[PDB]
From a paper:
Here we focus on [name] from [name], a recently discovered O-glycopeptidase that exclusively hydrolyzes the peptide bond N-terminal to serine or threonine residues substituted with an O-glycan. A glutamate residue, E206, is well-positioned to act as a general base/acid during catalysis.
The crystal structure of full-length [name] in its unliganded form was solved using zinc single-wavelength anomalous dispersion (Zn-SAD). The overall protein scaffold and the conformation of the OgpAWT1 and OgpAWT2 were essentially preserved (root mean square deviation, r.m.s.d., of 0.37 Å for 350 residues). However, the connecting loop α4–α5 (loop 9; residues 227–246) is unstructured in OgpAWT2 whereas in OgpAWT1 displays a short α-helix. A close inspection of the two crystal structures revealed that the protein crystallized as a monomer. The first β-sheet of the antiparallel β-sandwich domain consists of four β-strands with topology β6–β7–β8–β11, whereas the second β-sheet comprises four β-strands with topology β13–β12–β9–β10, with an overall size of 39 × 28 × 19 Å (“Methods” section). Both domains are separated by a long and open groove that runs parallel to the protein surface where the active site is located.
Author numbering: 25 to 312, 317 to 382
């Protein structure tokens, strides 16, 4: 019988989505499933869905998370896929993830009813050899890759260890926190660093480039991350909206970036055949990669003006004389385009388009 783990007693009802993240449990031809994976992974995926949804709600989007196909209460409809080759054919290195994704493309072409969006989370059991095992999982792809994400499973991959000061709890923050961040990449998120103010109130940005924090110390999603998720296919509540087709078409004009005291003033105009959902601004140190501090403003029109004032004291962690400001325009179909501008703190020069 299904029971709800204590970590899921506090949970919000989520909006029904038009597209769902596919969950594939990917087994080499010689690979057995890790026991109880249906329960363990359902619990972990539903808790992760709550994290994303509560953060979207906190940022004003309502109770919107990535969609999941639910088989029964507390149980995600996980596709168990038995692969054509042994697990050694799909390693972390040397294109293992690409080979697995290609094979799943064929599976979904043969069984299109099982595909619910362009986004897939592929989970593979750990290898068990002289390097990896239940106490040191690994061997398998573990990264975002395009719209897909690869993560791993092992016996103690179980929400009951969340936040426990134990060997298994530490393992969970590494591999579940890892899954949370890598899934972010699969959901179109780049890296970004919290602002000074957000760091003090909410902790560490999920998509920061440092060590995984999820489940161990306060972790949150930035406004810029949530603006991208707003335009992510598996967060859609609008069946008529198509995602990722074509090219990102945004005309940006009369761009001006000026510096006055501790304020950075960014302005210009935009025009697109699509609704432009939002502007994200990233301020980043070289090399051109360390985490950029991000900011976001809603737009919501096909044409208009944009204006953002950024306080330099929010730029926590930046320490280079050279810095780059990137303007990212996010479109309703989930594509985006960026423009970049480079400056030096010891020789600040206001920018204006020619
Ligand atoms: Zn990353």
């Amino acid at each position: 019988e299904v029971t709800v783990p204590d970590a899921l007693k506090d949970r919000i009802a989520l909006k029904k989505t038009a597209r769902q993240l596919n969950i594939v449990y990917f087994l080499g031809s010689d690979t057995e499933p890790v026991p109880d994976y249906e329960r363990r992974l359902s619990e972990l995926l539903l808790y992760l869905q709550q994290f994303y949804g509560k953060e979207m709600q906190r940022h004003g989007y309502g109770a919107r998370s990535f969609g999941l196909d639910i088989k029964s209460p507390g149980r995600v409809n996980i596709i168990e896929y038995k692969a054509k080759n042994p697990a050694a054919h799909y390693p972390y290195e040397n294109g293992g993830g690409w080979k697995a994704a290609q094979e799943l493309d064929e599976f979904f072409k043969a069984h299109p009813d099982r595909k619910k969006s362009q986004h897939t989370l592929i989970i593979m059991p750990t290898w068990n050899d002289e390097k990896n095992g239940p106490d040191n999982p690994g061997g398998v792809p573990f990264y975002g890759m395009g719209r897909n994400c690869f993560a791993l499973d092992y016996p103690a991959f179980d929400i009951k260890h969340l936040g426990q000061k134990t060997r298994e709890g530490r393992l969970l923050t590494k591999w579940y926190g890892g899954m949370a961040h890598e899934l972010g990449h699969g959901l179109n998120l780049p890296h970004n660093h919290q602002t000074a103010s957000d760091g003090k109130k909410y902790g560490t940005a999920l998509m920061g480039s440092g060590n995984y924090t999820f489940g161990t110390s306060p972790t949150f999603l930035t406004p810029a991350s949530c603006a991208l998720l707003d335009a992510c296919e598996v967060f859609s509540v609008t069946p008529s909206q198509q995602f990722y087709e074509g090219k990102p078409e945004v005309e940006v004009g009369d761009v001006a970036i000026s510096f006055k005291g501790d304020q950075i003033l960014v302005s210009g105009n935009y025009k697109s055949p699509q609704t432009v959902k939002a502007l994200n601004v990233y301020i980043q140190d070289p090399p051109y990669d360390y985490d950029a501090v991000s900011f976001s403003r809603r737009l919501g029109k096909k044409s208009g003006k944009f204006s953002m004032k950024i306080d330099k004291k929010e730029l926590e962690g930046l320490n280079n004389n050279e810095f780059r400001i990137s303007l990212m325009f996010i479109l309703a179909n989930g594509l985006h385009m960026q423009k970049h501008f480079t400056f030096h703190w010891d020789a600040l020069q206001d920018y204006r388009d020619g």
